[PDB]
Amino acid sequence: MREIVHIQAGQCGNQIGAKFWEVISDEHGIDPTGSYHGDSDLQLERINVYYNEAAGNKYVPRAILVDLEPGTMDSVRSGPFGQIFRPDNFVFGQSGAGNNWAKGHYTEGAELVDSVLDVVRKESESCDCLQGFQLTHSLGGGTGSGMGTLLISKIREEYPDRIMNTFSVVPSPKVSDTVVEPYNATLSVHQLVENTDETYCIDNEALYDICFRTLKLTTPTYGDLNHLVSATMSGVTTCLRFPGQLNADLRKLAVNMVPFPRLHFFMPGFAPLTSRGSQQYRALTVPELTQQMFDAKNMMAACDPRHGRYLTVAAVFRGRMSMKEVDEQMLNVQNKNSSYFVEWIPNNVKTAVCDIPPRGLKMSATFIGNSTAIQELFKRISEQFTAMFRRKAFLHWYTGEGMDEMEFTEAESNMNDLVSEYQQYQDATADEQGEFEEEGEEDEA
Amino acid sequence: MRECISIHVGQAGVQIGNACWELYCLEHGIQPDGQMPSDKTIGGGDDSFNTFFSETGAGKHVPRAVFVDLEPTVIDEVRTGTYRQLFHPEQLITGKEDAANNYARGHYTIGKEIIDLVLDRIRKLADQCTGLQGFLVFHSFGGGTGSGFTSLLMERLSVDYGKKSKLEFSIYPAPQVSTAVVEPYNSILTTHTTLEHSDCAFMVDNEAIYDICRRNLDIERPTYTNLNRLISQIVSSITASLRFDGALNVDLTEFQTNLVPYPRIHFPLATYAPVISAEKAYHEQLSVAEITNACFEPANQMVKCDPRHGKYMACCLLYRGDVVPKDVNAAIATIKTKRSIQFVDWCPTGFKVGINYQPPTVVPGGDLAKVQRAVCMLSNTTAIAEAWARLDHKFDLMYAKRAFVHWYVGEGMEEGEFSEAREDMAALEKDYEEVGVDSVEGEGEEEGEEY
Ligand SMILES: Nc1nc2c(ncn2[C@@H]2O[C@H](COP(=O)(O)OP(=O)(O)OP(=O)(O)O)[C@@H](O)[C@H]2O)c(=O)[nH]1
Ligand SMILES: Nc1nc2c(ncn2[C@@H]2O[C@H](COP(=O)(O)OP(=O)(O)O)[C@@H](O)[C@H]2O)c(=O)[nH]1
Ligand SMILES: [Mg+2]
């Protein structure tokens, strides 16, 4: 019934979706061709939230594949589960973005996008009840930032009441993937900040940390990271996909998660993340899970959340557990770690609980956090946009694509207005003073 | 003869609904498809299961019920579970998309999609009742649909069924536990509607009911499933005299003064006794004195506020099973002696009493105390003031920063409408205070009456 549309933009976004669709397919026990013989009726009864039933007992995912190149698509079509996709949903260029937002958003994608919107329309009309529009992409490169903006723009116009969500990869604090990554990460956000209800800030440097430090991986690779990432995307939807003691969809989470209409840029995180070398020496309990939810180091984003305060948090637990054990553990952290939280949002927590655990675990917990500390991204990228823009580096690549530097100036100005709004709500008091003025007139009569 | 109706709105409502209809089909020996496999009737007798079950067909009986959330999945589980055949499928309404913990969706933009459907099904339900007494309603009061739609339903019954008993049972938000962020706003937006319409409102609390379950009942890590099966013992007990014969009964038209000391204050607390494990009831035996004294203990109330911080105003005690009035009347005397209980000066005749013959029906596997003789207690106290005084401050904290206001505005409420609710909440604060005195003077208590 309540049916999400997925998009997968550029090389990065495509490969997160390519992992996503092995991973949720496995959770629903789906056969690599789009068949089924799996062990549970419950698994199949609900799948529709991410699938369509093709004739003679067959299953297709509500996925759109999006790229300005012939590259990465050819590998999804040869990989594990490459067969489930409707061949029609590959609508593709012969040009690339060139690491350039404006080539995505005002040239090569601008020439292609109406051919992709035509698949978005057809999947949105083939929905029962259209729920949302999720995107895997990046913000520091050219294609998923640039084409994905242009899609979001055109779809956010068409479907104003549906949720509009972005599982974004974002540039890391210390070493870079592409040199123009701060321009890309400003110009895409200069569209997304008033065209999304939800967006994520995924720091692959923290995934590389969590892959060595917690998960204890010897050679850690995209193979790993896109699992860790896609766990979080199937994990946030578990309270819509499946029954539990607290069902909760993405918008029911978002109303609790976003206080003011630009504070929607979230810190992700999962528990447990104990290695295969450590399983036998750790227990799998709500205390142990809630410990690793709020451990700084486990944070799949740019910073320790104690460079800020939590405006809001949401916990989406999975598997059979005492709601009382959960509620007590979420009450302990609010009262032992109260300095981590914004004080005029009285209690910062939304809780949800699915009966169904992920594969190979006793229980887990998906976590969405909103801390004012996410300015550690935006202080960097606005500065790093400025540092190159201030000497006018790389600029003719983008103004070759129908840009003027007034749009660059306007956008780094918007990012200052954003990081200043995020600071405006940082460290603000739960008390607001009265006056010392005096009533009537003052005599000893 | 006569009928109650049963309404579950939003996911807590619904979930509690699998719990209370399970208990009602134990307590009457109804199997999961509506058959009464040990029926004995002469036909056309009493036989009061007909107050809660409509007889269908050959001897299918059918719960006098309706259910909704605007999310499918929660009503789909009733449609699929142990009792799927118990329900008539047109009871089980759903929406396209949850009310998203915004009251505004439940009362305007999503709720309008299901309301006159919802009411048409009830018209059909009440058209079949012989002497409808009223409506008893579980709802997610702090939720999306449990907040917005229950209160839209209340307003939309009250124009047609204004003479029926309109009774409801929330889940209330809790002094340190928190399941959602906007829980307080919806709590006020719904209190601000259903104060004009409801004839009583029975507040109960998860953070409270856990502690009783880990203390008394001695349940190590309670579930929401455990909880809904405990919460089920309040409505069970206040229906015992609509379901079995007794030495003293009530009807729905009784609780709406005997729990309502003055109309704005329609907000009692409740509990049920003894609430102990097997190992404890094996070990040690309780009497109807002890079990009346336990209902007045702070640690034993299904809401977190200490009765001592306030004062009592109105009380209903509902005895089930092997007990006699000569003991029961002296056990209330007890509660009349210990000045650790204080009632208000306006209420020297503060006890109302009922006595049903049927013992509580022992649960499956015998997982509860084997006590033939259990008691429900329900009371209106001034101590609830200290549970509202947190909630109305939690509004004042968020609304100063307009935090989350934009989703309410998003679905079509105006800042005028959250401000009007908040000023009746500072008025509710004033109505808890009009009894904060000894005074008799004629606008709070009458100068020409004597108690
Ligand atoms: N005791 C108890 N409380 C519950 C249960 N389910 C939910 N709650 C409480 O009720 C609140 C609201 O639950 P929701 O799932 O949001 O109810 P809803 O009315 O369906 O809200 P929408 O889904 O937004 O329409 C939760 O935050 C809990 O405090 C339950 O089965 N038992
Ligand atoms: N997590 C993740 N990051 C990736 C992946 N592939 C590339 N990236 C990052 O995402 C960005 C590139 O996004 P993309 O839209 O493909 O850009 P383009 O190649 O410049 O058009 C860079 O910051 C890359 O480091 C991957 O598979 N997973
Ligand atoms: Mg709901």
Side-chain angles (χ1 to χ4, degrees), chain A residues 176-202:
Chain A
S176 64
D177 304 305
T178 273
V179 181
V180 283
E181 64 186 33
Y183 287 180
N184 294 331
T186 292
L187 294 196
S188 49
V189 173
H190 184 94
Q191 308 303 314
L192 279 206
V193 68
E194 68 177 71
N195 282 288
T196 44
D197 299 298
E198 300 192 284
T199 191
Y200 288 86
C201 307
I202 294 172

PDB file of all heavy atoms in Angstrom, chain A residues 176-202:
ATOM      1  N   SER A 176      40.238  14.274   0.324  1.00  0.00           N
ATOM      2  CA  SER A 176      39.234  14.487  -0.697  1.00  0.00           C
ATOM      3  C   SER A 176      39.097  13.442  -1.798  1.00  0.00           C
ATOM      4  O   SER A 176      40.031  12.712  -2.103  1.00  0.00           O
ATOM      5  CB  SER A 176      39.224  15.884  -1.311  1.00  0.00           C
ATOM      6  OG  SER A 176      40.442  16.081  -1.989  1.00  0.00           O
ATOM      7  N   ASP A 177      37.941  13.425  -2.459  1.00  0.00           N
ATOM      8  CA  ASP A 177      37.647  12.370  -3.404  1.00  0.00           C
ATOM      9  C   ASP A 177      37.821  12.872  -4.826  1.00  0.00           C
ATOM     10  O   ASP A 177      38.398  12.154  -5.642  1.00  0.00           O
ATOM     11  CB  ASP A 177      36.213  11.911  -3.160  1.00  0.00           C
ATOM     12  CG  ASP A 177      36.104  11.505  -1.694  1.00  0.00           C
ATOM     13  OD1 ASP A 177      36.908  10.645  -1.273  1.00  0.00           O
ATOM     14  OD2 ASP A 177      35.185  11.930  -0.954  1.00  0.00           O
ATOM     15  N   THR A 178      37.424  14.132  -5.000  1.00  0.00           N
ATOM     16  CA  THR A 178      37.511  15.056  -6.116  1.00  0.00           C
ATOM     17  C   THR A 178      37.782  16.438  -5.566  1.00  0.00           C
ATOM     18  O   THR A 178      37.436  16.801  -4.442  1.00  0.00           O
ATOM     19  CB  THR A 178      36.119  14.976  -6.740  1.00  0.00           C
ATOM     20  OG1 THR A 178      36.055  13.925  -7.677  1.00  0.00           O
ATOM     21  CG2 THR A 178      35.650  16.226  -7.496  1.00  0.00           C
ATOM     22  N   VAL A 179      38.461  17.291  -6.339  1.00  0.00           N
ATOM     23  CA  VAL A 179      38.992  18.545  -5.844  1.00  0.00           C
ATOM     24  C   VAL A 179      37.855  19.542  -5.719  1.00  0.00           C
ATOM     25  O   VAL A 179      37.868  20.329  -4.774  1.00  0.00           O
ATOM     26  CB  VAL A 179      40.054  19.135  -6.768  1.00  0.00           C
ATOM     27  CG1 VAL A 179      40.604  20.448  -6.209  1.00  0.00           C
ATOM     28  CG2 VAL A 179      41.284  18.271  -7.025  1.00  0.00           C
ATOM     29  N   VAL A 180      36.862  19.571  -6.616  1.00  0.00           N
ATOM     30  CA  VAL A 180      35.751  20.515  -6.593  1.00  0.00           C
ATOM     31  C   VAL A 180      34.619  20.262  -5.606  1.00  0.00           C
ATOM     32  O   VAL A 180      33.512  20.783  -5.677  1.00  0.00           O
ATOM     33  CB  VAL A 180      35.262  20.852  -7.998  1.00  0.00           C
ATOM     34  CG1 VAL A 180      36.322  21.825  -8.507  1.00  0.00           C
ATOM     35  CG2 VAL A 180      34.921  19.613  -8.811  1.00  0.00           C
ATOM     36  N   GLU A 181      34.876  19.275  -4.747  1.00  0.00           N
ATOM     37  CA  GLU A 181      33.917  18.747  -3.802  1.00  0.00           C
ATOM     38  C   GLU A 181      33.280  19.833  -2.952  1.00  0.00           C
ATOM     39  O   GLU A 181      32.082  19.652  -2.728  1.00  0.00           O
ATOM     40  CB  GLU A 181      34.427  17.560  -2.988  1.00  0.00           C
ATOM     41  CG  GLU A 181      35.598  17.732  -2.019  1.00  0.00           C
ATOM     42  CD  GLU A 181      36.037  16.406  -1.418  1.00  0.00           C
ATOM     43  OE1 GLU A 181      35.959  15.349  -2.080  1.00  0.00           O
ATOM     44  OE2 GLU A 181      36.314  16.353  -0.203  1.00  0.00           O
ATOM     45  N   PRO A 182      33.775  20.978  -2.469  1.00  0.00           N
ATOM     46  CA  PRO A 182      33.096  22.074  -1.823  1.00  0.00           C
ATOM     47  C   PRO A 182      32.187  23.003  -2.620  1.00  0.00           C
ATOM     48  O   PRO A 182      31.248  23.584  -2.080  1.00  0.00           O
ATOM     49  CB  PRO A 182      34.167  22.932  -1.159  1.00  0.00           C
ATOM     50  CG  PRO A 182      35.411  22.039  -1.251  1.00  0.00           C
ATOM     51  CD  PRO A 182      35.179  21.318  -2.582  1.00  0.00           C
ATOM     52  N   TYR A 183      32.477  23.220  -3.904  1.00  0.00           N
ATOM     53  CA  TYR A 183      31.546  23.799  -4.842  1.00  0.00           C
ATOM     54  C   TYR A 183      30.393  22.824  -5.032  1.00  0.00           C
ATOM     55  O   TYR A 183      29.273  23.222  -4.750  1.00  0.00           O
ATOM     56  CB  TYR A 183      32.296  23.937  -6.172  1.00  0.00           C
ATOM     57  CG  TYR A 183      33.366  24.984  -6.364  1.00  0.00           C
ATOM     58  CD1 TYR A 183      33.999  25.054  -7.609  1.00  0.00           C
ATOM     59  CD2 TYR A 183      33.607  25.968  -5.399  1.00  0.00           C
ATOM     60  CE1 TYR A 183      34.849  26.146  -7.866  1.00  0.00           C
ATOM     61  CE2 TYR A 183      34.520  26.992  -5.654  1.00  0.00           C
ATOM     62  CZ  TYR A 183      35.247  27.051  -6.869  1.00  0.00           C
ATOM     63  OH  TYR A 183      36.263  27.942  -7.010  1.00  0.00           O
ATOM     64  N   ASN A 184      30.667  21.560  -5.359  1.00  0.00           N
ATOM     65  CA  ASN A 184      29.571  20.644  -5.596  1.00  0.00           C
ATOM     66  C   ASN A 184      28.576  20.549  -4.454  1.00  0.00           C
ATOM     67  O   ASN A 184      27.390  20.759  -4.681  1.00  0.00           O
ATOM     68  CB  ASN A 184      29.981  19.245  -6.033  1.00  0.00           C
ATOM     69  CG  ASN A 184      30.637  19.290  -7.410  1.00  0.00           C
ATOM     70  OD1 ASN A 184      30.386  20.136  -8.269  1.00  0.00           O
ATOM     71  ND2 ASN A 184      31.728  18.539  -7.550  1.00  0.00           N
ATOM     72  N   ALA A 185      29.127  20.354  -3.249  1.00  0.00           N
ATOM     73  CA  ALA A 185      28.471  20.344  -1.959  1.00  0.00           C
ATOM     74  C   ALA A 185      27.869  21.651  -1.437  1.00  0.00           C
ATOM     75  O   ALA A 185      27.109  21.651  -0.469  1.00  0.00           O
ATOM     76  CB  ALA A 185      29.330  19.636  -0.907  1.00  0.00           C
ATOM     77  N   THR A 186      28.082  22.779  -2.110  1.00  0.00           N
ATOM     78  CA  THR A 186      27.309  23.992  -1.911  1.00  0.00           C
ATOM     79  C   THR A 186      26.153  24.221  -2.876  1.00  0.00           C
ATOM     80  O   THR A 186      25.018  24.420  -2.472  1.00  0.00           O
ATOM     81  CB  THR A 186      28.296  25.145  -1.795  1.00  0.00           C
ATOM     82  OG1 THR A 186      29.026  25.003  -0.605  1.00  0.00           O
ATOM     83  CG2 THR A 186      27.571  26.475  -1.662  1.00  0.00           C
ATOM     84  N   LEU A 187      26.431  24.057  -4.172  1.00  0.00           N
ATOM     85  CA  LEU A 187      25.460  24.264  -5.231  1.00  0.00           C
ATOM     86  C   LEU A 187      24.359  23.222  -5.200  1.00  0.00           C
ATOM     87  O   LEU A 187      23.253  23.678  -5.480  1.00  0.00           O
ATOM     88  CB  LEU A 187      26.200  24.075  -6.547  1.00  0.00           C
ATOM     89  CG  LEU A 187      27.285  25.082  -6.913  1.00  0.00           C
ATOM     90  CD1 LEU A 187      27.626  24.979  -8.405  1.00  0.00           C
ATOM     91  CD2 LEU A 187      26.855  26.538  -6.801  1.00  0.00           C
ATOM     92  N   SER A 188      24.596  21.964  -4.841  1.00  0.00           N
ATOM     93  CA  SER A 188      23.489  21.028  -4.723  1.00  0.00           C
ATOM     94  C   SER A 188      22.575  21.309  -3.534  1.00  0.00           C
ATOM     95  O   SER A 188      21.347  21.337  -3.607  1.00  0.00           O
ATOM     96  CB  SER A 188      24.065  19.614  -4.610  1.00  0.00           C
ATOM     97  OG  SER A 188      25.077  19.563  -3.632  1.00  0.00           O
ATOM     98  N   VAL A 189      23.208  21.704  -2.434  1.00  0.00           N
ATOM     99  CA  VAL A 189      22.465  21.988  -1.216  1.00  0.00           C
ATOM    100  C   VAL A 189      21.669  23.263  -1.407  1.00  0.00           C
ATOM    101  O   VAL A 189      20.626  23.453  -0.788  1.00  0.00           O
ATOM    102  CB  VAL A 189      23.438  22.166  -0.046  1.00  0.00           C
ATOM    103  CG1 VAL A 189      22.818  22.634   1.268  1.00  0.00           C
ATOM    104  CG2 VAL A 189      24.192  20.866   0.185  1.00  0.00           C
ATOM    105  N   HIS A 190      22.090  24.162  -2.306  1.00  0.00           N
ATOM    106  CA  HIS A 190      21.393  25.401  -2.557  1.00  0.00           C
ATOM    107  C   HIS A 190      20.069  25.205  -3.289  1.00  0.00           C
ATOM    108  O   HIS A 190      19.230  26.101  -3.217  1.00  0.00           O
ATOM    109  CB  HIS A 190      22.307  26.372  -3.299  1.00  0.00           C
ATOM    110  CG  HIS A 190      21.707  27.733  -3.525  1.00  0.00           C
ATOM    111  ND1 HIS A 190      21.901  28.815  -2.662  1.00  0.00           N
ATOM    112  CD2 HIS A 190      20.965  28.208  -4.569  1.00  0.00           C
ATOM    113  CE1 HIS A 190      21.409  29.896  -3.271  1.00  0.00           C
ATOM    114  NE2 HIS A 190      20.936  29.585  -4.495  1.00  0.00           N
ATOM    115  N   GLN A 191      19.850  24.006  -3.843  1.00  0.00           N
ATOM    116  CA  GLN A 191      18.562  23.405  -4.162  1.00  0.00           C
ATOM    117  C   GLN A 191      17.893  22.530  -3.117  1.00  0.00           C
ATOM    118  O   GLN A 191      16.694  22.752  -2.955  1.00  0.00           O
ATOM    119  CB  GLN A 191      18.694  22.408  -5.312  1.00  0.00           C
ATOM    120  CG  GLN A 191      19.404  22.994  -6.525  1.00  0.00           C
ATOM    121  CD  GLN A 191      18.782  24.255  -7.118  1.00  0.00           C
ATOM    122  OE1 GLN A 191      17.566  24.260  -7.274  1.00  0.00           O
ATOM    123  NE2 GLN A 191      19.567  25.197  -7.629  1.00  0.00           N
ATOM    124  N   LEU A 192      18.642  21.710  -2.383  1.00  0.00           N
ATOM    125  CA  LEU A 192      18.008  20.683  -1.584  1.00  0.00           C
ATOM    126  C   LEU A 192      17.381  21.198  -0.301  1.00  0.00           C
ATOM    127  O   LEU A 192      16.433  20.581   0.194  1.00  0.00           O
ATOM    128  CB  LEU A 192      19.060  19.665  -1.161  1.00  0.00           C
ATOM    129  CG  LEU A 192      19.523  18.549  -2.110  1.00  0.00           C
ATOM    130  CD1 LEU A 192      20.030  17.395  -1.248  1.00  0.00           C
ATOM    131  CD2 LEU A 192      18.395  18.053  -3.017  1.00  0.00           C
ATOM    132  N   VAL A 193      17.838  22.320   0.271  1.00  0.00           N
ATOM    133  CA  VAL A 193      17.484  22.877   1.556  1.00  0.00           C
ATOM    134  C   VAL A 193      16.040  23.353   1.641  1.00  0.00           C
ATOM    135  O   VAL A 193      15.558  23.649   2.734  1.00  0.00           O
ATOM    136  CB  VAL A 193      18.476  23.984   1.902  1.00  0.00           C
ATOM    137  CG1 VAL A 193      18.403  25.251   1.040  1.00  0.00           C
ATOM    138  CG2 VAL A 193      18.386  24.368   3.376  1.00  0.00           C
ATOM    139  N   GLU A 194      15.346  23.434   0.499  1.00  0.00           N
ATOM    140  CA  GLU A 194      13.966  23.850   0.401  1.00  0.00           C
ATOM    141  C   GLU A 194      13.265  22.997  -0.648  1.00  0.00           C
ATOM    142  O   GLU A 194      12.180  23.312  -1.112  1.00  0.00           O
ATOM    143  CB  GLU A 194      13.902  25.353   0.175  1.00  0.00           C
ATOM    144  CG  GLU A 194      14.452  25.684  -1.204  1.00  0.00           C
ATOM    145  CD  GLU A 194      14.324  27.171  -1.492  1.00  0.00           C
ATOM    146  OE1 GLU A 194      15.075  27.936  -0.846  1.00  0.00           O
ATOM    147  OE2 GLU A 194      13.490  27.581  -2.328  1.00  0.00           O
ATOM    148  N   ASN A 195      13.822  21.789  -0.774  1.00  0.00           N
ATOM    149  CA  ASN A 195      13.280  20.744  -1.621  1.00  0.00           C
ATOM    150  C   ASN A 195      13.426  19.340  -1.051  1.00  0.00           C
ATOM    151  O   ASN A 195      13.203  18.393  -1.803  1.00  0.00           O
ATOM    152  CB  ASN A 195      13.891  20.872  -3.007  1.00  0.00           C
ATOM    153  CG  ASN A 195      13.349  21.944  -3.939  1.00  0.00           C
ATOM    154  OD1 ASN A 195      12.226  21.752  -4.404  1.00  0.00           O
ATOM    155  ND2 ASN A 195      14.024  23.076  -4.178  1.00  0.00           N
ATOM    156  N   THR A 196      13.622  19.145   0.249  1.00  0.00           N
ATOM    157  CA  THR A 196      13.641  17.880   0.971  1.00  0.00           C
ATOM    158  C   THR A 196      12.975  18.045   2.323  1.00  0.00           C
ATOM    159  O   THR A 196      12.920  19.104   2.936  1.00  0.00           O
ATOM    160  CB  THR A 196      15.049  17.336   1.220  1.00  0.00           C
ATOM    161  OG1 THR A 196      15.937  18.347   1.646  1.00  0.00           O
ATOM    162  CG2 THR A 196      15.652  16.805  -0.078  1.00  0.00           C
ATOM    163  N   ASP A 197      12.421  16.931   2.814  1.00  0.00           N
ATOM    164  CA  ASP A 197      11.918  16.812   4.174  1.00  0.00           C
ATOM    165  C   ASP A 197      12.937  16.134   5.061  1.00  0.00           C
ATOM    166  O   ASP A 197      12.915  16.360   6.264  1.00  0.00           O
ATOM    167  CB  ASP A 197      10.602  16.033   4.180  1.00  0.00           C
ATOM    168  CG  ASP A 197       9.492  16.699   3.370  1.00  0.00           C
ATOM    169  OD1 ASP A 197       9.123  17.827   3.766  1.00  0.00           O
ATOM    170  OD2 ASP A 197       9.002  16.065   2.416  1.00  0.00           O
ATOM    171  N   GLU A 198      13.783  15.267   4.477  1.00  0.00           N
ATOM    172  CA  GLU A 198      14.877  14.545   5.089  1.00  0.00           C
ATOM    173  C   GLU A 198      16.114  14.517   4.195  1.00  0.00           C
ATOM    174  O   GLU A 198      15.897  14.247   3.015  1.00  0.00           O
ATOM    175  CB  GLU A 198      14.348  13.150   5.410  1.00  0.00           C
ATOM    176  CG  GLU A 198      13.154  13.087   6.354  1.00  0.00           C
ATOM    177  CD  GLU A 198      13.073  11.606   6.708  1.00  0.00           C
ATOM    178  OE1 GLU A 198      12.613  10.792   5.886  1.00  0.00           O
ATOM    179  OE2 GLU A 198      13.615  11.163   7.739  1.00  0.00           O
ATOM    180  N   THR A 199      17.298  14.597   4.807  1.00  0.00           N
ATOM    181  CA  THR A 199      18.570  14.367   4.140  1.00  0.00           C
ATOM    182  C   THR A 199      19.660  13.921   5.101  1.00  0.00           C
ATOM    183  O   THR A 199      19.744  14.207   6.282  1.00  0.00           O
ATOM    184  CB  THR A 199      19.088  15.589   3.391  1.00  0.00           C
ATOM    185  OG1 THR A 199      20.153  15.098   2.610  1.00  0.00           O
ATOM    186  CG2 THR A 199      19.467  16.815   4.215  1.00  0.00           C
ATOM    187  N   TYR A 200      20.507  13.028   4.575  1.00  0.00           N
ATOM    188  CA  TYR A 200      21.592  12.467   5.342  1.00  0.00           C
ATOM    189  C   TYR A 200      23.006  12.949   5.031  1.00  0.00           C
ATOM    190  O   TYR A 200      23.214  13.437   3.926  1.00  0.00           O
ATOM    191  CB  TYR A 200      21.509  10.945   5.391  1.00  0.00           C
ATOM    192  CG  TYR A 200      20.419  10.313   6.230  1.00  0.00           C
ATOM    193  CD1 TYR A 200      19.125  10.078   5.743  1.00  0.00           C
ATOM    194  CD2 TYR A 200      20.785  10.019   7.543  1.00  0.00           C
ATOM    195  CE1 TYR A 200      18.194   9.478   6.602  1.00  0.00           C
ATOM    196  CE2 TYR A 200      19.834   9.509   8.438  1.00  0.00           C
ATOM    197  CZ  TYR A 200      18.550   9.224   7.941  1.00  0.00           C
ATOM    198  OH  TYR A 200      17.643   8.678   8.794  1.00  0.00           O
ATOM    199  N   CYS A 201      23.913  12.919   6.013  1.00  0.00           N
ATOM    200  CA  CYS A 201      25.247  13.469   5.898  1.00  0.00           C
ATOM    201  C   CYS A 201      26.370  12.439   5.923  1.00  0.00           C
ATOM    202  O   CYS A 201      27.283  12.643   6.716  1.00  0.00           O
ATOM    203  CB  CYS A 201      25.355  14.452   7.063  1.00  0.00           C
ATOM    204  SG  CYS A 201      24.017  15.660   7.110  1.00  0.00           S
ATOM    205  N   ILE A 202      26.323  11.323   5.196  1.00  0.00           N
ATOM    206  CA  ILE A 202      27.222  10.199   5.361  1.00  0.00           C
ATOM    207  C   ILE A 202      28.654  10.421   4.922  1.00  0.00           C
ATOM    208  O   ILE A 202      28.930  10.693   3.755  1.00  0.00           O
ATOM    209  CB  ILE A 202      26.637   8.972   4.667  1.00  0.00           C
ATOM    210  CG1 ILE A 202      25.348   8.539   5.364  1.00  0.00           C
ATOM    211  CG2 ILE A 202      27.667   7.846   4.738  1.00  0.00           C
ATOM    212  CD1 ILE A 202      24.622   7.434   4.602  1.00  0.00           C
TER     213      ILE A 202
END
